[PDB]
Design a protein around this ligand. Structure first.
Ligand code: 5EF
Ligand code: ZN
Length: 257
């Protein structure tokens, strides 16, 4: 039932998914002054050179760029992590207006969008098993601001008209997710959850400090997507973000400053 509206948006999710009110929900506001610098946090190791993009899909909430996760080809490690985590997909959350769209906030600042690169811990063998574990996933979150175009994003932007509506897919090979990363890998980290139902508390969040820049034209193409399926009334895919949730008993750690 769930989605992003008055009637079925984030404030309703708890009725189907009670953990929505749990102890380690995401996203959160990142209070930069109160984040704890941890000298012992390692640099993040992002090894995406063998990544094998396969397909891009409109799942009716967002669009997902999928990877072959049947071998260690695109992996995240280091940082605050203790194992190796394989990239399964990325997606974005974005707004109706440039002034909103991110899930995490930084000193209450909203960004225009937020990229989630989703990885699962190889010690659990597959994504479905990993989501049942408290250290099953590592999600790398990257903020988007509007300004100069991100040229590594354009291949995603240009395919979107082929996946306008829920359930559409398109071959999407040879997409290189290194083109979506900012210069710095400095990050904040905390234990949290998936930000969409089922809201499972299985995620080590790693949120990069440095946003990427995308153009107004790029984010405008995200907003032409539709949450409905073909042959239904148009509902633009905008404002597909969950607001910040209570931090409760958590400390956000910083790799820097
Ligand atoms: N926004 S988020 O970063 O916290 C995030 C989620 F919120 C979320 F719910 C899921 S899910 O359980 O797999 C959805 C399956 O039904 C994923 N995981 C991925 C991998 C599989 C998949 C399929 C569809 C949509 C997202 C995901 C997720 F990355
Ligand atoms: Zn997400």
């Amino acid at each position: 039932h769930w989605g992003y509206g008055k009637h079925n948006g984030p404030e309703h999710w708890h009725k189907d998914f009670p953990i929505a009110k749990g102890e380690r929900q995401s996203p959160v506001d990142i209070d930069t002054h109160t984040a704890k610098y941890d000298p012992s946090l390692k640099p993040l190791s992002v090894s995406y050179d063998q990544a094998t993009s396969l397909r891009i899909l409109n799942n009716g909430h967002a669009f997902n760029v999928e990877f072959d996760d049947s071998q260690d080809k695109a992996v995240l490690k280091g940082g605050p992590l203790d194992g190796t985590y394989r990239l399964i997909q990325f997606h974005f959350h974005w707004g109706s207006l440039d002034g909103q769209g991110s899930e995490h906030t930084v000193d209450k600042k909203k960004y225009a969008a937020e990229l989630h690169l989703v990885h699962w811990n190889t010690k659990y063998g597959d994504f479905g098993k990993a989501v049942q574990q408290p250290d099953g996933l590592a999600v790398l979150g990257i903020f988007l601001k509007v300004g100069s175009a991100k040229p590594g994003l354009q291949k995603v932007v240009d395919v979107l008209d082929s996946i306008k509506t829920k359930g559409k897919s398109a071959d999407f090979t040879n997409f290189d997710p290194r083109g979506l990363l900012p210069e710095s890998l400095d990050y904040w980290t905390y234990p949290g959850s998936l930000t969409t139902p089922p809201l499972l508390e299985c995620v080590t969040w790693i949120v990069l400090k440095e946003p990427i820049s995308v153009s107004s034209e790029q984010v405008l193409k995200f907003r032409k997507l539709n949450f409905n399926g073909e042959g239904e009334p148009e509902e633009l895919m905008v404002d597909n973000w969950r607001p910040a949730q209570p931090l409760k008993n958590r400390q956000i750690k910083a790799s820097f400053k």
